[PDB]
Symmetry: C4
Subunit: 380 residues, 4 copies
């Protein structure tokens, strides 16, 4: 996990959302020292357990109510239970990762500090801060608007089925913990995306420095710079591996949640399109599909960019080899090429899959198969 | 994108079809300088938007007509809408790529110029021009004949359902913009295929030169030639990567269109084969299947050939190593082997997939699954 | 197969379970010499044949009984027959592997002896013995408890269908050989897991020694130590390949059994959840799903860990290269890097698949497809 | 294609079966010179066309007969047509490959001659001849017995439906060309398997020679021997690539035929098992499944063995590196390691897939999916 001053707002958002139980103090040097915060550790654990319990309690209440609003049919019951469970598992994995990833966070931030010192020429505090805040604000505003639309639509739908001998609005009110879990999931995804995008951006800055200092006494300093760049590349690879070892289960459950959410939301949209009982419901389902696809991209594109930027450095190094003649600098470039030949760049989600754009294709296939089975199941 | 004098006809076809909004002037040296053409840029954008709007307007008109011709049943409505949407998305991606790929086009053509200068011994202006013109003419004639057959069949079918209180021929007439989109798609595919086939052909020429100059004072010139060949190979790899970064979204949507078109056309053929209402319709569907498969090959085989030709150069270089003894030439061959060891040759469609013949297999599986679900859906 | 003093209990369990027909004598040096035991060879073969015959005889008896308990419906008959056949094939493959893998076992144990001598600094006899005994005891206790629950549930179910003109409890009693096959399968899986986990643990110890002796006269001894570590790594790779060549068919049938068992047990759970005839049956099916998933992990995680630990040594060697300066030691490290560049670490199940965590994903897809077809089949 | 004296019987079988239209003359040196045989070329082409026409004519006759025997139901018609078409396409691809693969055959046999001269120490004329003749005889006897059983079963079935106003035995008699196509397919598969197994066996002999001459004045001769072994390895790789470029389409259609045949035969077996009209039909379907699986293995295992034997030579070369000290011999071993690092060993079926054991897994998945759809289709 990355905890830097430009992106400290994302850190605070994740902290209040039970995902970053760390206490950070900014040094007089501008560095952010990180340690365990037991108060926020127990707060995160308790909030996660309480909200999961409340979410499932509301689910059971809807299922056991006189007029269920969402959990009415066996198919609807199963789909809604799966939708709630994927969110619960994703947020629980994120909280667990944030609880037991302090050492990885410290190592990653130290490595990023040395890399930024090496790449001080391309650091943009203002631009990085604004990109981080914009991503966080856009994600939170999108989820807030979407939750408002969903709750309003479901309140209208529940009032449409309201019978004088029962209240169906409390059923919708009991689904608020699920939306809180959605907010926690959005914060976790924003944090992971910020970290992965920072890693990829640093890879790109390293490649730009390589191309600008080697393709655009003194040779000794140039070789020292190349050694520093190679060390930064190795440290960025290790930072990617740390992010993986820390949040791979979280990323895996996020991907599972995206897949199941897309399938379930498309199934609900198809049902409403056949029945055409409501149009606002249809548009809310389209917005949910867009949100799920956008967050799938949010979790996929960062790792793909990081791997792509790290795997394009070997070509630059080959160019330097072909253009370099100095003995010590040529030897340093040879060492760098050897180091890059065996670089493991792709992000691994607990070893189950390598997170890149190819996943999307696979996802589509699954979303093409299951959803179509599900549709066939409706007919049958 | 490749814009050369031998294939200038393909460039003009793509330009009038809203895909190559560039102004080209032939120098006294025979070189083709390329720049942005704002007139044709706005013409391409406006034509794309207008024809997409007209296509979807005709779709809605057919769906909302008294006697729909094509959009009659929910299954038929969905299938026809998907068929039209894949074409719309493919042509829109191609137009967008041609609009925002001027720098990549310039770089690719400069690189191809230097490569052709290096490979002047195997350049065949007449043969290249005739192959390009033959490909373009065959593609355009095939799509024209197929559109004529389809429109005649659909006119007959609409007249068969004609009731005195309505005209069903205007429904077919309103599907002409869709056929125009098909022409644009054919032009885009022809252009992409010409570029990729040129890259693969240059790879093959480079390999032939390697084998004829190294396996079939003076050693200094031979090493200079080997250095030029290595530079040409690296430039061809970068040209492949430029073509990818420029038209990968277009290739991806072309592949999606081919898959969905094959599935939908096979479904329609199976329906007509059960009902046997018309035989000309069945033969037109078979011709459509052939056309879609042929254009899938048109987009797949070029990249496969390019990768295959680029990946077989390392074996030739190993042979030279095993046969070369001169110091400087041996060092140059070692440098070339090192360069080839880390060559990224496969064509990437926006990172979603690597375009090669393996895709075909996968496609078949999908075409075996979805189509079979679709058939089962008819029964259900 | 690994036969060591710490894990000799697992060896005895596999021996009485017809999986390790070897006679072992402990030398005065603490080494375990292994040879063929013809008495136990014929005992294993005869027990396997007899128990397979009894299992299938009980299956036929249930199918041909007046009131079948498990083999009642065509779907139930097929599912139960597949469930029994996967277990039979898995245990038969394990027994055959143990019968015809004496040379591989001897080679593997010799190699492990030399490796342990090399890694004597990290050997923990007590911890290894306790981990092995704990794994064996947990597996055997889990399968025993699960068999008891299953047999009690099926006895209750059979008594519920009991008619005065027939006894349905003998039908359940005739399924005891199948549970014995389950015990044999558990023992085989425990043995394979112990061997693979030992290989991975030795890889980890080798990497720890590398990092502690090279990143934490004399240089000659250090280079000798590095040569010994490289030899140990190569021997561990060859031990992995021996385990593969010996028990790959067994691992493949174990994976097939896990897949089919998960599908069938989930199908039975879904049936009981629709009918809700019994709740103990549902909980027993959940326990069976947990057991099958846990043993799938038991067979998958060891190979994944071994490959992961073997593939992370090249980065350590690159670090030594970047930090080493001595001539002979630098040459030894270069030799080690060259050796690691071409290391085949992944475990192969008879060439059909590479056993790692990715399999899980694929399995899920299959378990998502077949089971869903099976559910659709119930409706149809 | 391999045409050697030990396997000349397989060559004659393929020649009379329209697959090897070559004239071979044995020199006084024992070498077999190969050339085009126009008589047998036209005989092969004419026989292929005539038998395909007769097969499809019998298919149409059965479909258009008063009482169809095999082509009765739409599902049965489609399945039988696909079964016949896969065989037709496989044999046509094999015949076309044999017609237009004379240059590849000559190159492959020259390379095999030089390799055998290099590996004269491990050549076993008697064993190779007997293995080739045994494979051919077993394949031909199996297909003959299976065709006899199938034709007898279908004659009985046709006589069971015989009505006094028509003859249903001529319908079975008109399916004899299909069995002739099966014989041609068996011969083609036997030839391809013999060639691929010879390549893999030569790879194994090369590895054995490496291990026996380097791990079990004079050093100059040893380095000469190593150079010859490296040349033999490169020639064997090129022979594999020649076999691919010559018969990849044939292998691809053989694999497609195996897949479709397994699916169709299992579907027919399931139908007969539900109806239980005949038991001999069921056993014949089981025998057909066994035959199709065995020929799938016949086409898969050879390439897998070749790749496995070629990919295990680099480890032996690393061992020699680690054990070799002589300057010239060490340099030769380094050259060999460099050559092996970039070896393309896997067999490619026209670029669609790499033929190895992994295919089997994929096949199973397909055979698990389609067949299950097909079963569901019966219910629907
Ligand atoms: O299921 C349709 C949509 O409704 C939600 O459950 C929100 O309450 C989402 O998980 C899903 O996208
Ligand atoms: O759908 C069947 C065929 O008809 C078309 O729509 C042409 O109008 C094609 O897209 C398709 O191949
Ligand atoms: O089929 C449901 C369960 O019952 C068993 O057959 C045990 O008798 C298991 O193989 C399976 O997990
Ligand atoms: O279809 C069942 C079997 O019958 C055959 O057609 C033989 O006539 C085979 O192709 C198939 O294995
Ligand atoms: Na179905
Ligand atoms: Na599928």
């Amino acid at each position: 996990m990355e905890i830097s001053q430009p992106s400290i707002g994302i850190f605070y958002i994740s902290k209040v959302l039970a995902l970053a139980p760390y206490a950070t103090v900014r040094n007089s040097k501008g560095r952010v020292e990180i340690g365990r915060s037991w108060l926020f550790t127990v707060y995160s654990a308790t909030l996660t357990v309480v909200m999961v319990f409340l979410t499932y309690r509301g689910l059971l209440f809807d299922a056991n109510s006189e007029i269920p609003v969402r959990m009415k049919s066996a198919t609807s019951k199963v789909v809604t239970a799966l939708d709630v469970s994927v969110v619960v598992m994703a947020i629980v994995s994120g909280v667990y990762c944030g609880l037991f990833s302090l050492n990885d966070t410290l190592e990653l931030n130290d490595r990023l500090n040395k890399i930024d010192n090496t790449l001080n020429a391309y650091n943009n505090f203002r631009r990085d801060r604004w990109r981080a805040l914009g991503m966080a604000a856009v994600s939170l505003l999108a989820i807030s608007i979407l939750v408002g639309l969903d709750v309003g639509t479901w309140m209208r739908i529940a009032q449409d089925m309201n019978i004088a001998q029962s209240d169906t609005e409390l059923n919708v009110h009991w689904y608020i913990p699920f939306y809180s879990l959605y907010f926690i999931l959005t914060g976790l995804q924003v944090n992971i995306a910020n970290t992965a995008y920072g890693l990829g951006r640093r890879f790109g800055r390293l490649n730009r420095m390589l191309s600008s200092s080697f393709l655009a006494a003194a040779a000794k300093n140039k070789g020292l710079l190349l050694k520093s760049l190679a060390d930064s590349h190795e440290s960025l690879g290790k930072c990617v591996h740390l992010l993986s070892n820390s949040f791979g289960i979280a990323v895996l459950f996020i991907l599972v949640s995206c897949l199941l959410h897309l399938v379930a939301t498309a199934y609900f949209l198809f049902l409403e399109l056949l029945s055409k009982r409501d149009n606002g419901y249809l548009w809310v389902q389209m917005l949910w599909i867009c949100f799920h696809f956008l967050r799938l991209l949010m979790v996929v594109e960062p790792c793909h960019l990081a791997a792509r930027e790290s795997r394009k450095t070997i070509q630059i190094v080959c160019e330097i080899e072909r253009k370099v003649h100095e003995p010590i600098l040529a030897e340093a470039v040879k060492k760098f090429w050897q180091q890059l030949l065996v670089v493991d760049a792709d992000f691994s989600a607990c070893g189950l899959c390598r997170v890149n754009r190819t996943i999307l294709t696979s996802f589509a296939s699954a979303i093409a198969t299951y959803l179509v089975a599900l549709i066939q199941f409706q007919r049958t």
